[PDB]
Amino acid sequence: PALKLALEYIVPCMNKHGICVVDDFLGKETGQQIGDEVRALHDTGKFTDGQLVSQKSDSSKDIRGDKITWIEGKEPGCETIGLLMSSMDDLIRHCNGKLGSYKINGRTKAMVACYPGNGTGYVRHVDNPNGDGRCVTCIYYLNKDWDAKVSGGILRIFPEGKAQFADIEPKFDRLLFFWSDRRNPHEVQPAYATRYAIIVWYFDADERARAKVKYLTG
């Protein structure tokens, strides 16, 4: 039930901690369907090297070792990813005007991401450091049988002002929210097995408008 989950758990969690974990979000059947769809995308060569906002002399693989593709939710064979995305959107809509001072009106497409084992990860970073509009990061994990003590892949967040950092294992059917800005620097520790996630970034209307203005004027 979106209303209660959003207003009585996600909103207070986000406003107090900037991080919110919802375990067993969709159930095993839907999570497994999503996993099959993601593995189909992988198996048919859809993934490409993850990119960075600003590219410079260094290789992107020195920064993030994952391969990704962008999904709208209506593509053939991505119907359950679409259901995931719609459920995400429903929760966010039910939090309207209650997540900080943001006014969330839109989001990116879904980034389906794979770290292909071999110790790939993502160096310490901030998702939105310079105000490109992203205010909330939403991640769904679908790694059945993952044992993070052996296979790694832990998301470590350093929430600002906290006495402890937050370790999030990429558990099957886990949903995660956190502020995208500098309050939550984070890293994806090296993965030694194939690690899948689906990420959407939700936009604050005003910040996103300013970012687009900066882009469209050079």
Partner: peptide, 19 residues
């Protein structure tokens, strides 16, 4: 450091999903 050199890419152009 320019943290944008470490931030995950999103399309700035083309267009976004409206909720």
């Amino acid at each position: 450091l320019d943290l944008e050199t470490l931030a995950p890419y999103i399309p700035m152009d083309g267009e976004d999903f409206q909720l």
